[PDB]
C-alpha cells in the first residue's frame, strides 16, 4: 500500500525525509531519487533489510550493493586505504562517482558486499539523498530502482511500473538529472580500473589516471526492454535493418528524426546529455508502443554517449556492427 511523496530536489521538506528515515529504522525498503537514477535502499548495517532489496529486485545474491554515504567521516567508518585518493574523492564528491575500497568490516554485513572483502561507496550529489542519509544516521545500500534486468528508473512513473504495491514509500523529486548510473572506478589494485562508465567521463579519468584500465566487458556486451533490442553501430545498415525487422519502432536523434516511420526522438547530438537523460525512458516508451522490435541508432563511443552505448550494448538482443 504505497505512498508517493513529492519533494523539492534542492530544499526537500525534512518532515517527508523523517518519515522515510523512520521506515529505514524499522528495517523497511524505500525508493529515493539521486542525481543519476532512483535507488531502492535499506539500512546498510541491517542484514535482514538488505535481503528484502534482493527479493524486491528478483536479484541474484552474488550481485553486491553500493553503500551511499553523506560525509567523509562515514567513509572512515566503512573503508580503509583510501587516504592516498582523498584529494581525488574531495574533487568528485559529492557526485556521480562510486569507488571500490577494501572494506573496514565491522558493521557492513556480508549480504551487502556478496561476501566480498571490497565495498562500493558513493556520496551522491542530490540534496534529498544527502539529507535522507544524514537524518537516518546510517549509510544506505541501494541498487538502481528497477526489477533486476530492466531499464534503471529515471522518474516516478518507471518506479511505479516496477514497484507500486511492493514498497511502503517512494520519494518523488522528478526526472533524475543524468539518467545514467554513477561511474564505477576500482582503486584497490596496482592500477585503477573502470567497471561502469557514467557521468564522470572516461576522458576525464584518463587525464587524472594515465594508467586507467578499461576492461573488454566495458567496451563490449541488464537494462533490457520487454521487446527485443536491435542496436545499429553502423548506420549505413539502417535502411537494411528496418526491412529485416518489419514490426519495428525506432529510437533516433533530433537530427535524423524526419527520416523514419514510428520514431521516438531520445534527444539531439547538439546536446548529448539530453540523450543520456532520456535513453532509459525511451526503452520504456518503446516497449509499450506495440511493435515487435525496438531499433536503436548507435552513438559516438565518446563522452557521455560512451556510457549510453555501454548500457544499450548490454540491453541489445543483437548488435549490428
Ligand atoms: N564491492 C564491489 N566490487 C565490485 N563491483 C561492485 C561492488 N559493489 C557493487 N558493485 C557493482 O556495482 C553495480 C551496482 O549496480 P546495481 O546495484 O544497480 O545492479 P545491476 O548490476 O545494474 O543489476 P540490476 O539489473 O539488478 O539493477 C553492480 O554491477 C555491482 O556488482
Ligand atoms: C541509486 C544510484 O545511486 C545508483 N546506485 C548509482 O550508482 O548511480
Ligand atoms: Mg541496476
Indicate the domain borders of the chain.
Answer: 3-216, 220-320
Fold of 3-216: DHBP synthase (3.90.870)
**Residue 161: how many CB atoms within 10 A of its CB?**
15
In Å, the largest CA–CA distance within the chain is 58
Question: What are 284-290's contacts with CB under 8 Å, separation 24+?
Answer: 284/151, 284/158, 284/161, 284/225, 286/225, 286/227, 286/249, 286/251, 287/225, 287/226, 287/227, 289/249, 289/262, 289/264
The residue written with cell numbers 587524472 in the block is 208
d(CA 38, CA 59): 17
Q: For ligand 2, atom 1, name the residue with the nearest CA.
A: 39
- Taking the centre of ligand 2 as the mean of its atom positions, its distance from the CA of residue 238, in whole angstroms, is 33
What whole-number distance in Å separates Cα of residue 40 and Cα of residue 30?
A: 6
Confirm or deny that 158 is annotated as ligand binding.
no
Pocket probe for ligand 1: among 110, 116, 120, the residue whose CB has the most ligand atoms within 8 Å is: 120
CA distance 267 to 264: 9
**Contact 95/136 with Cβ under 8 angstroms?**
no
Pick the ligand that lies closest to the CA of residue 133.
2
Least distant ligand from the CA of 224:
1
Cβ neighbours of residue 85 under 8 Å, at least 6 residues apart?
Answer: 99, 187
Cα 254 to middle of ligand 2, angstroms? 28
User: Best mutation site among 31, 55, 60, 63 for ligand 1, i.e. most ligand atoms within 8 A of its Cβ?
Assistant: 63
Compute the distance between CA of residue 268 and CA of residue 321 in angstroms, rounded to an integer: 22
If you measure from the C-alpha of residue 259 to the centroid of ligand 3, how many angstroms do you get, rounded to a whole number?
A: 33
CA distance 58 to 262: 33
| 66 CB near ligand 2 (under 6 Å) | yes
Q: How was this structure determined?
A: X-ray
Class of domain 220-320: alpha beta
Amino acid at each position: 500500500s504505497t505512498r508517493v511523496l513529492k519533494v523539492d530536489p534542492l530544499f526537500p521538506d525534512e518532515k517527508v525525509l523523517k518519515e522515510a528515515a523512520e521506515l529505514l529504522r524499522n528495517g523497511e525498503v524505500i525508493i529515493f531519487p539521486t542525481e543519476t537514477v532512483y535507488g531502492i535502499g535499506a539500512d546498510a548495517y541491517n542484514e535482514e533489510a538488505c535481503k528484502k532489496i534482493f527479493k524486491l529486485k528478483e536479484r541474484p545474491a552474488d550481485n553486491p550493493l553500493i553503500v551511499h554515504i553523506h560525509s567523509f567521516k562515514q567513509l572512515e567508518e566503512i573503508a580503509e586505504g583510501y587516504e592516498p585518493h582523498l584529494d581525488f574523492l574531495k574533487k568528485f564528491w559529492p557526485g556521480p562517482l562510486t569507488v571500490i575500497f577494501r572494506k573496514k568490516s565491522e558493521k557492513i554485513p556480508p549480504v551487502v558486499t556478496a561476501d566480498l572483502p571490497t565495498v562500493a561507496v558513493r556520496m551522491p550529489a542530490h540534496p534529498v539523498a544527502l539529507k535522507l542519509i544524514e537524518l537516518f544516521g546510517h549509510p544506505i545500500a541501494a541498487p538502481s530502482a528497477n526489477i533486476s534486468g530492466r531499464p534503471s528508473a529515471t522518474n516516478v512513473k518507471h518506479v511505479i511500473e516496477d514497484f507500486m504495491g511492493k514498497v511502503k514509500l517512494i520519494i518523488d523529486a522528478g526526472d533524475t538529472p543524468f539518467g545514467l548510473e554513477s561511474t564505477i572506478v576500482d582503486l584497490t589494485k596496482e592500477k585503477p580500473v573502470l567497471l561502469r562508465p557514467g557521468p564522470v567521463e572516461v576522458e576525464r579519468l584518463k587525464e587524472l589516471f594515465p594508467e586507467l584500465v578499461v576492461p573488454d566487458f566495458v567496451r563490449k556486451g541488464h537494462y533490457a526492454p520487454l521487446k527485443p533490442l536491435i542496436l545499429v553501430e553502423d548506420l549505413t545498415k539502417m535502411e537494411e535493418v528496418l526491412k529485416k525487422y518489419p514490426d519495428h519502432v525506432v529510437i533516433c536523434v533530433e537530427e535524423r528524426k524526419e527520416l523514419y516511420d514510428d520514431r521516438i526522438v531520445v534527444g539531439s547530438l547538439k546536446n548529448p546529455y539530453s540523450i543520456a537523460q532520456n535513453i532509459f525512458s525511451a526503452l520504456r516508451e518503446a516497449e509499450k508502443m506495440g511493435k515487435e522490435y525496438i531499433i536503436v541508432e548507435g552513438f559516438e563511443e565518446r563522452g557521455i554517449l560512451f556510457a549510453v552505448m555501454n548500457r544499450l550494448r548490454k540491453a541489445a538482443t543483437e548488435i549490428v556492427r
